[PDB]
Design a protein around this nucleic acid. Structure first.
Ligand code: NA
Length: 92
DNA sequence: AATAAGCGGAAGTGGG
DNA sequence: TCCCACTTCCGCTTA
């Protein structure tokens, strides 16, 4: 099954949910979710995974928090809804 | 207060 | 057995 970081990188590459997520500085791997439209993207993540419950942005961000300990995706301090893929993730 | 978001421990579920 | 990669639940904190 696809991993969350790959789902997000794939969305950013395809542009299929451009009103829910976008690059801020793609060379640095920084991206941001839409305050008003992030739930639609969270719903899609849960459906792609086949999870029992409806996925929410909060539960998705809880998963993203675990990536911050390992560095796969860092949450930018002093900003809202803004994250940064590691260099390794961006290399493919 | 209402709303939004951050924070994160702990326990539950998948698939090895 | 026991870790993976989240998911779900709960509650406190900050804005
Ligand atoms: Na536990």
């Amino acid at each position: 099954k696809i991993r969350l970081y790959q789902f997000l990188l794939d969305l950013l590459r395809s542009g299929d949910m451009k009103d829910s997520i976008w690059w801020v500085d793609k060379d640095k791997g920084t991206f941001q979710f839409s305050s008003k439209h992030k739930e639609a993207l969270a719903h899609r993540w849960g459906i792609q995974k086949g999870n029992r419950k409806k996925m929410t942005y909060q539960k998705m961000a809880r998963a993203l928090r675990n990536y911050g300990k390992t560095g796969i995706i860092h949450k930018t301090a002093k900003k809202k809804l803004t994250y940064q893929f590691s260099g390794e993730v961006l290399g493919r």
